[PDB]
């Protein structure tokens, strides 16, 4: 059941913003890694004293990379005189939430109707204001609330290119890779404690929860936009088993919650990974080990339907995970975490039927791919 | 004249370190754009629960790249039982050395017969000591004195395979990239005050003044050791001129003094160059821009003895600058800065001449290509 009770208008995912130590340095090494294309700048070259700040894009995917300059550089500044094209930004804040987490997300960033309202409705619903709606050029206004952890939820509206103050950047330094990656699927986060953090997410939002589950490491739940569009699931650690929860993991390296991963959807999997996998050892990122040929030999008794055994054998060789629930059917894989914690890694998928346009989350998340990983793994042994 | 009064046994380079925010993506993004391999690291992984420190080489060029980890994975630590393979490292210089400085060297290292007499002996003779010496495994020595600014001259001596602590890489993660270079031919500081910098330096280490000079936005010399294989050129501003001192620019933008640029010796540089320039847009380093037409004609007049029409032609397609002393011929080219601050750049080299083995400094350090660069400049205008 969808009770659409969005409190107000969501389109859909818009960015997600890294705050780095160098933006120049990692946004390089996603571009080659991910195959995402230079497509704007906000930095010294732009006017930009207060901090620098590159954007990548593959299809609708935008990633944000952010670092700020030396405090010196825009020390006669105040917020009326600010330099800054993000005017959320701040030097101190910045500098905190990366020594604290280390590279990752600080902002979720979604489009909705006005940002202003979007805002207002979610602070009077409880959420805890972030940074206030602001108005660039009169044609983009921005907004933010804290979502959990440092992380922040960021609202974006458009009267009518990213943002105002950026440059399109320059043909040359624009070099237009594309590996398949099309748009940002959903966004995981870890927290201690998944009751609180998930009524209150909801609370402001009015998001309903599309799926939920309970050996594995962890309990999770996902909450939704009224056309399923937005997914934003969030885990916890089930303390007390055998192997150590790695939500447990991911919060005692990350100095507590944040965001967990965030699932890129490809218009052709395989084609991503084979252009991914090619580059993991000169620069690129790597992914988790490969299952048995156990798994991929169950494979045809699960999705031989969906799946020829030449396609089920290319997932094999590219190390693809396969799930199902009772709609549709879902290709994922995982890297190993993008930067020196075990914390945020990426998640490619790409979903099989649900047809109507596509509904979202066809097909779920993958929880089936623990218990038939660890069976698959048992076998092999023997 | 060589006086050759080095204070202790100096042999060679031995390699740089950079601080940084994530050294994943740093050296990731080096590892690619310059053509070194993956050949050691010291990470949680190994054991090490303090830093990510992960090891780049390229013959005998060893890049180093650095980060903390979170405080609270080395809580319980004391010095006398860290689980650091690096002793002189501290969480708390490596993000203040990073807030204030961004991406840069911390670590100038140079190969001594024994590091605890060449400490001692600097000390001595006014170097202010940074980490005393300490022996790892009983194997290795390492010692630091400050350099300049925040930069820490280090000193590493042998008994008899990085360090003691750090794994050889997996030959998975281990691609064997190399684009031709093979060693650091010298490493250059920017400094407010030559003089006092150029008598501290020279001071402890008994290094001798190689070169010096003096329209063009700087003053400079360069200190040596005895068979001159270790260089340090050291820069101050000319203030007072019409273009902005880009030495200055560098202190504004550094917060202060630092390592300016690194120059790496290619043993075929119109190889090394080519490889560089196909991945500037994808993930590599970009270069300055070339020189006029005018630059590559006047060539002929200054170096068609020791380079063919069809070798000056290949410099025209790199965009590489010549200069030339009494004794040989220097190809130099330099890349824009590597992070996000106008501040740390690379240099890539080939000399040409002095045959006895070469002797370093063959060729100067391209201080006529001001000159010409700018004569090249105003030709091409008209
Ligand atoms: C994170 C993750 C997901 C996942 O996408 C997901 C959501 O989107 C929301 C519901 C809860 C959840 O976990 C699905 C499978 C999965 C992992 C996984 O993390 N790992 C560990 C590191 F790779 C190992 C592993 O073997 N499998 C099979
Ligand atoms: C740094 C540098 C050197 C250089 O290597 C050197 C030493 O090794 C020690 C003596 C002093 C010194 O400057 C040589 C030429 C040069 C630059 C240069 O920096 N730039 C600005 C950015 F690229 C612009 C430019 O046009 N030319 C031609
Ligand atoms: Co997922
Ligand atoms: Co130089």
Redesign the pocket.
């Known amino acids: 059941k969808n009770p659409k009770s969005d409190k107000f208008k969501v389109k859909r995912f818009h960015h997600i913003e890294f705050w780095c130590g160098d933006a120049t340095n990692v946004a390089r090494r996603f571009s080659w890694g991910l195959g995402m294309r230079f497509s704007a700048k906000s930095d010294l070259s732009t006017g930009n004293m207060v901090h620098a700040s590159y954007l990548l894009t593959s299809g609708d995917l935008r990633f944000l990379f952010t670092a700020p300059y030396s405090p010196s550089l825009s020390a006669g500044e105040i917020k009326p005189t600010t330099t800054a094209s993000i005017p959320s930004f701040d030097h101190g804040s910045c500098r905190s939430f990366f020594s604290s987490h280390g590279l990752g997300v600080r902002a979720v960033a979604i489009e909705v109707e006005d940002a202003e309202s979007a805002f207002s409705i979610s602070v009077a619903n409880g959420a805890i204001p972030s940074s206030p709606p602001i108005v660039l050029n009169e044609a983009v206004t921005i907004a933010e609330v804290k979502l959990y952890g440092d992380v922040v939820l960021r609202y974006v509206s458009y009267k009518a290119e990213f943002l105002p103050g950026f440059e399109r950047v320059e043909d040359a330094s624009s070099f237009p890779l594309d590996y398949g990656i099309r748009r940002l699927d959903?966004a995981?986060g870890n927290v201690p404690e998944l009751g609180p953090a998930l009524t209150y997410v909801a609370g402001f939002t009015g998001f309903h929860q599309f799926?939920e589950?309970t050996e594995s490491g962890?309990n999770?739940?996902?909450l939704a936009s009224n056309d399923e569009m937005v997914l934003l699931?969030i885990?916890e650690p089930v303390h007390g088993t055998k192997r150590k929860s790695?939500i447990q993991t991911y919060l005692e390296h990350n100095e507590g919650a944040g965001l967990?991963?965030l699932?890129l959807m490809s218009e052709d999997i395989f084609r991503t990974l084979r252009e991914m996998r090619k580059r993991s050892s000169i620069g690129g990122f790597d992914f988790?080990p490969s299952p048995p040929p156990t798994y991929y030999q169950n494979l045809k008794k699960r999705v031989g339907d969906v799946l020829s055994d030449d396609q089920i054998k290319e997932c094999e060789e590219l190390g693809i995970?396969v799930?199902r629930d009772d709609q549709g059917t879902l290709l994922?894989i995982?890297?190993?975490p993008l930067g020196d914690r075990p914390t945020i890694?990426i998640?490619i998928?790409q979903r099989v039927g649900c047809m109507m346009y596509q509904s979202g989350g066809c097909g779920?998340?993958?929880?089936g791919?623990?218990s038939?990983?660890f069976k698959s793994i048992e076998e092999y042994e023997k």
């Open positions: 959903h995981v799926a589950f962890l999770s739940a996902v699931p885990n790695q967990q991963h699932a988790m995970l799930d994922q995982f890297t190993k890694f998640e998928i779920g998340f993958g929880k791919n623990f038939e990983l």
